[PDB]
């Protein structure tokens, strides 16, 4: 794999990407936080091949957390084989064993929607081990279901973990500050006002005026949302994904196309953001259309 | 029986708890204001999302969920009738904090004297929270929540909920409720005012440093080092700045609201605080007495016993911003 | 396209939105034929009236990831991993890639949709469908075995707008789902034509639409408490007249007491006079 | 049976118009209305053949679950076997006789969680989605060879009570699938007075007693919040004690005042002995 | 092993380290409470070598409590064999058997994030037995799953226990005060003020002016944090672990490095910390850059 | 078993120990209800030998309850063999059986931390027999797991039950219904203002006035605890055993030794107690230091 392969279709600046790869080599654990629709899931599979430098999915594992996800499934626990119960080494436990075989090559474990599941319960023993300075046999730990103290589990040094956490829901947030220290948090923005996003549109037979008009609209729109941090922080603001997909047929992005998409998706979305003000909903809708 | 206009009272609680337009509501009485705060306040939380705390559940189910407890499993022999004892984490809004809101709304609706709109809208909201379980509220429940894992916003409405429950009295009927006559008693009004200033001064007087200071008597006793019999003396507030220190004692009195004799009994406490207090910096020593008045504000200064002391009042019922302006005007004179 | 009481624009909108985006939520009050819309619509997209492709389920608060996708459940001998329907269903559509298989989701609002779907909450989006985006599930013993939604799959969810829950709002799922409102359609000729094609009186039909619309506008009057989402549907009128009993005010008045009155009670709770007024309004 | 029923004839006839079409129904009312006896006679009325075999009855509670109701695994001497529940057995029995209407009684339905018990089936019981078209594989039905569908003949009755103020608003699940009917106590009804006048009761004693309870039922419903229309007392207690062989009398009434109404009146108010003492003494004379 | 080797790099005052030994040796069970990043995990492995006087891990055991540890895992529980269950002595029971094999040499059992789990549930019978007074054969007690033949389990005197309760999660704090008497709680400060912290940076090619500039700012922030108690208490104040790491390659500390720290880790932390006004965030973030 | 050895060292007034012996012969089911650190566990071991009048371990049994403790272990239950299930007589069942042989001799069962487990879930059916009046073979019952009804169990009259319950948690406001009927609660004072506690310090070379100064602080502070009911009742107040411990060397009491206790036990305990008002913590901490 190579760097330039990713950047061709990526709307995020390279400078942030350099910051991303810089920390991850150091901290070995990262979390990318932004609103939905900015390619967190998109980059994460790409970024892995960058860090390894080779397109190996064997070395990469990608999972999505949720409420009913637990230490027993993730790490270790007793589960039914059949008539007889057995201890089933979870996916993360097995992932490290593969990585142990190949210490040189980096192995990556990717957690989508991390903030949902109770991470404190899930990681558990891992919460201490995963830190960059504590990896290796020297900090070996026995697990809950380990037969004895001698059976011990150590995270390899090579492992890199990437977590994806939306900023739309304040209920589900990584409030456990001890857990926050392990992860280096990298905010991501929609990146409307970028050449790469614009070049993709112009590449898709788009008017230079209409594209630039659109960028002002969303950028100003997001700025209004970020202002009222009491109700809605910057994390809530709209992503670029609604505009990204759906143009595969070859339809040029005219104003008629824009008027359609806002009607179906953004309009009701705005209603919840501004429940009390119908005028404010009507104001911003009309601003895009006019 | 004249008292402060009720709308202004709510602002004093804001500083009291340390954290909107009140012109919209037409009901002068307090519970109309406070009920509207909660009824509207709940809506802000719901938009962002209510607190969801993972409560572990250990129950007997037809399958494996999370971690099986081997001990309880075999002892109940649930394996044979296709059941297991397993511990797992249902994600609910059934927290103690959220139950208080729903239980509180019942009391708000049950209050006999209330605006029709307020009671109507909440009953929908009461209906809108089906999963949560009603509770019979006591202060001990609020006491348990002093940990404050919840956000800063949650603590605001709960602080209101603490106010309402304590200031709720059963009225004409066994079921319904009646609001407390908060205004008439000075003591709760007084503790509010002392608390109102103490947290208020932290906000606005960023220039100065403000702390409540405990003081120890200059006395020595042959009998006891403890001096337990001697009164405990704890300042209401001290607002120290590099150029000058200042100690304040403020209280709410009904007689002083009348424009005759004057109630300055608290002053006896104030001087004695000045004497036992010795400043290491030795910049200056100043004193203030401030009381609530309704009609107008008057400021005086004194040079009493070699100390520079001010007695002043504030025209409550005027306007909340000018009152906010009024205090900053006040303290600047004496803080010098 | 004949007995549907919704305008042709909405159904024409839906198929273009659905085929492109591949996920949609049809939200409206009860009694607007959400089921009949979806079931008819599914047969259009396949092009054949084949129900085996189509599967419908009705969510409820107790439904869980154990049932939907995967789960550990007991056989007669003991415990095993039992494939939930959607795991079972996508495998079925994966069997035949060319044809279009449909999954219908009723009573979606009740359950914590994130909790149920879990892993597939990412996978369902149209771009992220295929082996490249596959993931091992929670209960999969080995990472190598994975689950991926195929491109052929299309998902429809039917949501009641009249039971708002101030518990969980997810705007990320809203990114996956393209939301479509449905109006009751009293104004539509197609509903009126059916009544006129059931030997109804012309004035009675015109009087009927005015009666419901005046109430419907009242329901949408106070946006704060209630909205267009609450307003009454037409479907109560569809049933019960296929025996041969043509419409009459007596039959309508029966429905007023039979069906509408609890709804009114439910909606205008602790307001007898307004129910008494609006109930009596229809009878007049 | 029709004259034997004490409730208005209009209510009796009206229900069958609802049930035949809707196929799902719930009666919410005070205790002591003959709700159990009502449904049975009404169930026999719909079939017309007075067959108890067609009708099956179940009483819900919080523990009642999908395994009891539908299907589950039960222990053998060694191991365990799949064990058909009531409703699964019930419908398959009715499947043989399509023309024959079969009725199912779920008592104290509001106590249990409908979702928890039914599960999958909760949509299949709604009349619009019925029959082989809407077949679904069951939770423990490992194979896809056989699916569970309730045939059209099935009618579902739910017995719920409006007695308790502790009960909050009804579950949303119920409201969609069920038609809600309230049954009056029926004191005013002639059929109840002819059930006392046939037993040689004095018309004054009869009419006074009917007037006596009506004033009581009106006052208990006067309360807006705590005691509603549903609280008001039913008539079934009056049946109990007369047709065994003992004639009506004020002393027989006096026992019943102490028997049920006096503790019942305590339950509803549960606050004031004087107000209870007023009514309890007033009922006697 | 001796104090000289361990305290070469450690940023803690000597005062606590000996004071720790004063309370521990008499009391034998302690908890060190501080925010994450103050070396709680770091010292604990080192302390084991002092009291034993030698660097041996065998007399040491290290574990972490993840809100799913149980008495079945800690002490005595039932595990599946191929077809049927058997009774398994847990790690702690296994640990005491080794420790009571020789009373002379001290044995340590270490519990990270001890505050999380419901400790009363896990320890059970031990909650009495851990205490210094009630040790030895005199206070032997029979366990839950003990055999009918009388066999009793007693904490040997040589055992010393250390707990690591982070101060971030207030909810997950010891409110079972009966248990809080068994332990002696030793507060650990962030560790900024000490010169022993300062020397570590200066030895790694750092200017004292830049160091003294940095440390001045942190205490102001922690003072700003220390002032509040409603949400952000005294304990939340920032640790020094962030600054420890990432300098091994030879990269000297400068504002570029500090700027990476401030934007990347601390700045997300601050907005979560305050989450009332952004103005408070921008001031203090900019202070560090200034 | 002479009283002078037993009761002289004890801090409690002779009034309470005698009263304890009265109800214990009468009712035989007794609960000592007080905060931690008043010797609840301490006294019960001595009292058992007092009533029997001799030091015999066999006649006396000790247990601590916790959530995992159950009927199946306590009384009777089935423990799996390699595959098969064997019934096993539990402790309390086995304990009484010894008492049957020697009916004259008094037998004692000691239950620490009783509130944690529900009495019904553990005792269950035997709560019927456990009652003081309904003892002896007349009220015999056949057990749940008995193969036949012929086999029966009756609580012999000779056994007396002692249960130690701590009023240290808020949850215990809802006391279990089972305890109140069957047990006789006794309140145990903290026991600072007592003669024997004072003389113990004086015997360990302590200044009398400083001790009297200390007691007034504890007596004064504990009063502040008792006045509140919402957060801290009378039952929460400090016990007298922090100071008892730690003097086995002979180290004299002083402000430094006091400060060791204050910083390491009582100061952070107060942080948990008086969270809402940090200054209220400051108010007392400085008071004790003086
Ligand atoms: N072609 C292209 N698509 C992009 C780019 N960035 C984002 N997208 C698209 O936006 C959609 C969502 O990507 P995703 O990472 O899941 O966004 P997200 O922020 O993770 N959403 P969520 O947080 O809700 O999971 C996909 O269609 C993705 O390909 C891009 O740079 N190029
Ligand atoms: N070199 C050196 N590193 C230190 C010192 N103090 C802390 N650290 C470093 O800071 C990082 C984390 O320390 P750690 O003990 O895990 O803190 P913790 O309190 O245990 N973490 P947590 O509270 O999250 O469990 C490690 O790199 C650790 O070595 C120190 O004095 N010297
Ligand atoms: N010498 C002496 N020690 C006492 C006296 N009272 C209590 N202690 C000591 O206090 C320490 C703990 O006593 P203990 O009974 O365990 O208190 P507890 O009620 O069991 N504690 P908890 O409630 O937390 O379980 C022991 O050293 C005990 O001997 C006493 O009167 N004399
Ligand atoms: N002919 C016709 N029937 C309809 C229409 N809408 C609904 N129905 C019928 O109304 C009955 C109930 O529909 P249902 O799905 O339960 O209502 P909903 O789920 O709340 O939308 C079925 O017979 C529907 O087919 C319609 O637009 N035209
Ligand atoms: N013969 C006859 N008995 C009735 C009638 N109505 C109620 N009953 C009797 O009243 C009793 C049932 O009352 P019910 O309310 O169902 O008892 P509950 O379920 O405990 O509330 C039985 O004795 C019924 O036969 C009736 O109309 N005719
Ligand atoms: Mg995404
Ligand atoms: Mg650590
Ligand atoms: Mg004890």
Residue numbers in the entry:
A (entry chain C), E (entry chain B), F (entry chain A): 168 to 457
B (entry chain M): 3 to 21, 28 to 267, 272 to 348
C (entry chain D): 174 to 457
D (entry chain E): 173 to 457
Kindly provide excerpts from the paper associated with this entry.
Three-dimensional (3D) classification resulted in nine major classes with varying tilt angle, indicative of conformational plasticity. The dimeric interface mainly constitutes helix H9 and has a total buried surface area of ~3000 Å2. The catalytic residues, Asp244, Asp257, and Lys259, are located close to the dimeric interface and aligned along the FA interface of McrB.
McrBC is an antiphage defense system of Escherichia coli that specifically cleaves invading DNA that are methylated.
